Structure formats: C-alpha cells, structure tokens
Scaffold this active site. Sequence first.
Site, short mmCIF file in Angstrom:
data_model
loop_
_atom_site.label_atom_id
_atom_site.label_comp_id
_atom_site.label_asym_id
_atom_site.label_seq_id
_atom_site.Cartn_x
_atom_site.Cartn_y
_atom_site.Cartn_z
CE1 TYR B 49 84.55 5.22 71.80
CE2 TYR B 49 83.64 2.83 72.37
CZ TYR B 49 84.05 4.03 72.72
OH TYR B 49 84.59 4.47 74.19
CD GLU B 51 87.85 7.90 70.36
OE1 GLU B 51 87.68 7.79 71.72
OE2 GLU B 51 88.73 7.42 69.44
CG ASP B 195 75.88 28.42 79.52
OD1 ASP B 195 75.25 28.01 78.97
OD2 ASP B 195 76.47 28.18 80.58
CB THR B 221 71.85 22.37 77.92
OG1 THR B 221 70.53 23.43 78.14
CG2 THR B 221 72.94 22.45 78.88
CE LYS B 224 69.39 24.22 81.66
NZ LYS B 224 70.65 23.53 81.02
NE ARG B 230 69.51 15.38 81.55
CZ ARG B 230 68.82 16.29 82.19
NH1 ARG B 230 67.41 16.33 82.09
NH2 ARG B 230 69.21 17.18 83.09
#
Lengths: 412, 411
Positions: B49, B51, B195, B221, B224, B230
């Site tokens: 974790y 955060e 984008d 992203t 691609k 991903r």
Amino acid sequence: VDYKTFDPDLWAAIAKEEERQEHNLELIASENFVSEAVMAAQGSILTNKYAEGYPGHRYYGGCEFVDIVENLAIDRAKELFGAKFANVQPHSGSQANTAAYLALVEPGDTILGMDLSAGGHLTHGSPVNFSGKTYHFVAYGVDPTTEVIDYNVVRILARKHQPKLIVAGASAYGRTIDFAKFREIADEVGAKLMVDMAHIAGLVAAGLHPNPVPYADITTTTTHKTLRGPRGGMILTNDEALAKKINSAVFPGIQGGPLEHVIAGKAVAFKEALDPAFKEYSEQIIANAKAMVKVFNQAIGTRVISGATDNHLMLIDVRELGINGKEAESILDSVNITVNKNSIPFETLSPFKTSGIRIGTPAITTRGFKEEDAVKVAELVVKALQAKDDNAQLDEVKTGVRELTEKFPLHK
Amino acid sequence: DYKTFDPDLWAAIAKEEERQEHNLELIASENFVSEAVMAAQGSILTNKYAEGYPGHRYYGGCEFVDIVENLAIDRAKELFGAKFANVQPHSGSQANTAAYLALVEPGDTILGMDLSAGGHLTHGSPVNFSGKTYHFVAYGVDPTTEVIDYNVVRILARKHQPKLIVAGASAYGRTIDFAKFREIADEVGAKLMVDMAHIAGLVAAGLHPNPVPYADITTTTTHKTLRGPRGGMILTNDEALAKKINSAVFPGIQGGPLEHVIAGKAVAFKEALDPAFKEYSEQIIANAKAMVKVFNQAIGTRVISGATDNHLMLIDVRELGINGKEAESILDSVNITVNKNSIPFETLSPFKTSGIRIGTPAITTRGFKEEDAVKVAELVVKALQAKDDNAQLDEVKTGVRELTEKFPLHK
Ligand SMILES: CN1c2c(O)nc(N)nc2NC[C@@H]1CNc1ccc(C(=O)N[C@@H](CCC(=O)O)C(=O)O)cc1
Ligand SMILES: CN1c2c(O)nc(N)nc2NC[C@@H]1CNc1ccc(C(=O)N[C@@H](CCC(=O)O)C(=O)O)cc1
Ligand SMILES: CN1c2c(O)nc(N)nc2NC[C@@H]1CNc1ccc(C(=O)N[C@@H](CCC(=O)O)C(=O)O)cc1
Ligand SMILES: Cc1ncc(COP(=O)(O)O)c(CNCC(=O)O)c1O
Ligand SMILES: Cc1ncc(COP(=O)(O)O)c(CNCC(=O)O)c1O
C-alpha cells in the site's frame, strides 16, 4: 536475469523491496502476501488484450479466452459470497465505489456514511474525495465512551437527514458491523444500503463476519486485503436491475479496458478462497488479532480503540506515550516493524500526524505466524514504543524481529 | 505446479498465449510487452500500500517503492520533456478523469473530438462520465477529406466559448496539429488538453509532433505504441496544475496505486529511451503506410482519408456488403484479429459500425517488415472478398500461418 542487466536500477529496487518484505514485520492491516499463482497471473500475457465490454459482448475481436478468465472470476465471486451478480472489472476499491454510487444515487443526493476519523474510508464521504465532492454526505461516527457504532445515533441521523443511501463499512473499525440493523434503519427511512466490505471480505468469505450481501442493495469490495488477491475492486448485487446499472457504470461509464491479467489474479485468488484451507487461515487471522489486542490492552500507553477486536485489525491511540501516530510509525520502522499512522475517533491532529497507529494481522498470518508469535509481535511493538530512544532497548526489538522473520521465511 | 490447483484458469491463459502466437494481432491499441514488463507486473510490489506520492506516503515501508515510482516519473519526464509527471492513473480513463478535474468544473463547456470522427469515449461521449459530467461540443472531420478542418474547430471554439479544448484520438490516422490547437485555445481563452494515448510511442520517438510543449495537460496510456503495461499517466509543465493533478488522482479519484504496474511503466520507459525503440517506432509507420497502399488499390476496401501518418488506419468495408462487425468475425475465422470501428459520419450503431480499424504496433513488435505488412494487408483483402468461398479462406489461413511461423512471438 537477462533483462535485469538492461535496467539495473529498477531491478535493484525491486530486489530491495523483496528483502524489505522478508526482513520486516508487515503490520499494515490492509496488506497481505499474495500467492505465486496470483503474481504469475498478473505477470502473464493477458496484459496485452483489449477487452472493452463484458464476456460475450466485447468491442474487440479475439476475446474468446479472456472471456473464460473473466467468467471464472465472476462465477467464483458469486460462489464465494452468494451474490446473483458480480462485476470484477473495477481497477480498485475506489473505482468500485464510484460505480456503486452511480448505480444508486444522483449527484447532490444525501448519503449517510461513516466518518473518516471514526473509521470510514475516504470514499465514504471525505470532502477531499470524489464522494464528498459529488454527493451530500452526512457522517456517523462511534460513541465517545465505547468507541463502537451507536446504531441509535445512526437511526437518529437517518430520520433527521432522510438520506437516499446509507453506507456501511470501514477502513479502521475492529468490531462486528450489524448489517441487519443497518438494513432495518435504511428501510425505516426508505434509503438504499451500500456495504463496502473491502477490509473484511476474506473474513466474510470464511463465514467469520456476518455477510452483508443479502442485506445491501450493492456490496463493494477490494480483492487485495483479507481476500489475499491482486489489487483491484469488485461489485456484488442480487438485484438484476442494479446489476445492469453497475455494469454500465463501470464501463463505459467510468472505465475503459479492464485489466484482464489482474482479473486472472482475481480468479486465482477466489479459487484459493473457496478452498477449505482459506477458512483456517481466516480464523487464524482473528485469533492472532485478538492475541495482540490482549497484549496491547495490558500495556499502559497503547490504548486499543473500543478495547477489543472482532476481526483482523486494531486501532491504537498512542497519545499517552507522548507521541503522535507519525512518530510511532517511524519508531516502529526503525526496528523493522511496518505499520501506518492512523486517525482515531475524534481525531484532533492532521491526517499526516494523527493520534494513533493501525495494526492488522493478515500478512503475518499468511507468512505463518500463530498466536504465540502474534503475542511476541505485540510485545515487541509495546517495547519499541516505550523505549523513548533507549537504543539498547531498540536493538533488542530488532533482535526479536530478526528471530521472527527468520523463523517464518516469506519469499525464501 | 500451482497450475495444478487451478487447471481451468491456467488452461485459459495457455490458450490466450497460443492465440497471440498464431493470430495476426491488428488491433491498433494493442502491443506485446517485454519479458521485463511482465516480470515487473508479476512481482511482489503488488503487496505494498503506497497512498500518497514518493516521500509523502500514508504508510510505512515505502523506501523502495518510492525509488521505483520516481524511476517511472523521471523517465517519463526525459521521454516527453514534461516538467511534471503523475504515473499513478490506473488507466487512460482514470488519467482523463483526473485531468478534467484539474482543468474544469462540472457543467463547463468542453470542445472535444466526436467519437465517430475518431475521438475517444472520454472525449465527451454521453454514455461516459465525460459527456455526463460536462457540456461537450464536438468537432469532427471534413466529409470529403476525412481529416480535421482546423477552421471549423476555430469556428466552434469561437461560437461555444469552451473552457477547455481536448485534442487527441482513438481512430485518427493523420497528424494532429497541436500547435494549431494551442493557437485556437488561446484565441478563445480556453485551456488545452491533449490525450496522446495512441501516438505516445511515436511522440517519444520524434515521429509525431510532441503535444507536451503546447498542452496545459497531456494525458496518455502506457500500453499502446509506448509498449508498456496497462495504465495511465498525466503530464504537465505548470507547477500549479501538477499539484491539482496530484490531488485529483489521489485522494481525488483513486486510493492506493498499483506499484507493480508502475514498476512495469518504469521498465517500459527505459526501453523507449533506448535507440532501438526509435527504429521500432519508424517500422510501425512504415508498415502502416505499406498496408494502406494495398488497401487503397484493393477494390472494396476504402481507407478513411486515403493515407496514414501514424500507426493506424480505418477501413470502410461497406462496398463488400458487410458491416464492421461482420468484417471482424470473418477475419477472426481466418486468425486475423481486428476490431469493428466507427468511421466518420458513421450511420450504424457502435456495435455494428461501417468499418474495421487496423494498426501495426503489435506485428511490428513481432518483427514484421514492409514486405510482411503488405502480405497481411493482402490477406485481409482476400478474406473480406472471399464471400463464402471457404477454399479462399483456407488459403488466407495458410498465409497467416506462414507469417506467424516466420515471426515467432512467445516461442
Ligand atoms: C486508507 N486510509 C484510511 C481511510 O480511508 N480511512 C481511515 N479511517 N483510515 C485510513 N488509514 C490509512 C489511509 C489514510 N488516507 C488518507 C486519509 C486522509 C486524507 C486527507 O484527508 N488528506 C487531505 C489532507 C492531508 C493533510 O492535511 O496532511 C488531502 O488534501 O489530501 C488522505 C488520505
Ligand atoms: C476505445 N473505443 C473507441 C473509442 O472510444 N473511440 C473510437 N473512435 N473508436 C473506438 N474503437 C474501439 C472502442 C469502441 N468503444 C465503444 C464505442 C461506442 C460505445 C457506445 O456508444 N456504447 C453505447 C451503446 C452502443 C450501442 O448502440 O450498441 C452504450 O450505451 O454503451 C461504447 C464503447
Ligand atoms: C467540406 N465542408 C463541410 C461540409 O460540406 N459539411 C460538413 N458537415 N462539414 C464540413 N466541414 C468543412 C467544410 C465546410 N466548412 C465551412 C465552415 C464555415 C463556413 C462559413 O461559415 N462560411 C460562411 C461565411 C461566414 C461568415 O464569415 O460570417 C460563408 O458564407 O461561406 C463555410 C464552410
Ligand atoms: C473500505 C475501503 N474501501 C475502499 C478502499 C479503496 O481501495 P483502493 O485503495 O484499491 O482504491 C479502501 C482502501 N483501504 C486502504 C487501507 O485501509 O489502508 C477501503 O479500506
Ligand atoms: C485516446 C485514448 N484515451 C484514453 C483511452 C482509455 O484508456 P483505458 O482503456 O486504459 O481506460 C483510450 C483507449 N483506446 C482503446 C482503443 O483505441 O482501442 C484512448 O484511445
């Protein structure tokens, strides 16, 4: 080892983290150690597939086998928890809750949810989170004396505020939650009920915590806490109409392509959780947590919120040791015990200092600790916090951690 | 061995492995990540974790996860020239969600590319959070050229006075003039968001104009043409936006980040900094242009806009008497994997469509060169023209076999 030569800096960091998990006591209540199969699924070629849509109804060709994986995860989820419908595509617990609200209420609607200091999650109505920004949250907390949920206060708030939705569930609540009572209050004021069982989902699956799925309009969860799966979210429901809204909310509502390799890890972990060994693990979780609570209760200076635990975690008020949660965290770190600072009910300091620490047993239970060892961990925690920079005392704590980490190898 | 505990899952994973091996992956948004990227995603980093952001976490024990995430941030900055980077978005949709939060308010007017013309769902589709949360005005492409008419974009921006203009596309094969978009946004007092998810690898290789100097915020992203795991990423040069981006990602819309995925991002960014990546990226565009030439000369397949400048193409299949979904199913039966896709001024539903989309990043990664790209295009044409001649289809299958046997992937 061939590609590790191309990127030495990165693989060196990953190796250190593996040693860190090996040589520290991981007491973060929301952490765990996943199986090799879970890691292999996440490290698989499924990361290469675009699969927008749902099994059988994709926006891409070539989803024959990703559809098998995702239906594996859906079906095992439905079997673990008794839900008629499951969505396994949420990227996280936060995405799951985002879509759940989309299926249940409208922006600006009134929602009654657990206050963050008392134990609720950010996504249960914090004003720095989408939940508090998008909807009108009324917060319920815990009683100042017993530090457990006062269900009469919940009912009072529900009658006063007439919420569209009541949220139950918590990130830092060590006690049994009465979902039936919540359902009863929601029915009295005509509200829906959403339950976020992320922390206790494994205990629910083992039948060691009351199951919210029959009661809640929608049940959300993460897969990576007591369920011991990969990091990700899930949404459960028994209402076919809500199931349609949930699926549309997740995609194309708030997400695009699902992480099918992570969903493979979910299918892996759900089958592990369906195994009878998982139930024994879950009882060990609670047995270990109760053992530590007993040590902490006898010590002056570690004050267990509500004085008891029914599940995997405990919230410890450290104020009487003359420290705050941030320093308690770093002290315990210097002796290789990993916790997180945590707000306690009626918290007066900032979320970055806090008045306490949170401790949970799922990760040490997974690496094999039993109650004798849990007791030694808690004694080590108490000793380190009372040390007050007596460096000799601290080094003894390091020794006890070293004995515990060597007695229970993890990645070795 | 752990595979024996769950034979159904592991059989499915093995079948998907053969499928990637023995099919032609022509989905424009897919790729084949390295063994290192998969190893990173399959690591123990999933147990942490984390955060917060490096150095300022809400949990203990983040010393080494902080190294990993800073590796990813720093390499992103060197790849794209951004002064700030956020590598925590779980996906491109999460990236855009946080970007909008950092730029505009609910209900604000946003000008973004129409989905049929090539824009993404998150560029204002009304079934998506974007169209539901904000007032989207759409620009499209010219009906005759099927490329962006920047004067029509300026007219729309002047007319509707958007707070934000969004540029970028999921199915646009042509160069986007980000400089022009910046100029239009400036004239009407709007912010500009780009984008670049599809072209980010091409941008990194210097084969597509870089939007980072122009856009207030650039989203992408990592999976691609960047050939990473991903996930999403958010770039900016403005210190104030960077702070708003970070709060929007967390605690705004996400919780703990996926640190094993961020590890894979760091892996992939260093791969993209290597000079071989630029040659890979050049081969992408060469292969795409090669296929476009085959499709142009073939009777029955029409290339939208008639040319490509990047990795992808939209093929109007209507003259074959089929729709995009049927074209998708035909090609799948001969082991060619595409996706149906809307074309500009689409008249059918997004589940039927009038075309298919084809991209070269994945076959380029297996090693295809232009000769082989040309053969793929010829096979696609042969299969779509086969029209219930099963003999022809079996010949297409044979040619796919020759290509996948010539360029092994997971073997
Ligand atoms: C998961 N989370 C959590 C939670 O959601 N609920 C409880 N009860 N306990 C915990 N414990 C661990 C973790 C804490 N996460 C948090 C908690 C609070 C905040 C928060 O209010 N941050 C504000 C102010 C932060 C500050 O003042 O330092 C922000 O603008 O980011 C941000 C993140
Ligand atoms: C990623 N995505 C995409 C995109 O966002 N933009 C373009 N130009 N092309 C593509 N190609 C591939 C993929 C297609 N995704 C889509 C496209 C359209 C929709 C859509 O309009 N769905 C509607 C109903 C569609 C229907 O009538 O079947 C919904 O309520 O879910 C939903 C998802
Ligand atoms: C080819 N064409 C075209 C088309 O035929 N159909 C569509 N849907 N979209 C497009 N997009 C690009 C192009 C047409 N573009 C435009 C855009 C604006 C105008 C325009 O307002 N011209 C006015 C003058 C307006 C003025 O200055 O007040 C005229 O009388 O010619 C004229 C043509
Ligand atoms: C009850 C609950 N719901 C949702 C989430 C969010 O899950 P993601 O971090 O995957 O978005 C958490 C995280 N709880 C983290 C902790 O207690 O440390 C949670 O405790
Ligand atoms: C430009 C753009 N932006 C955002 C996204 C969303 O990313 P996620 O799927 O990780 O949410 C996509 C997906 N494009 C998918 C395709 O073209 O097939 C995209 O093309």
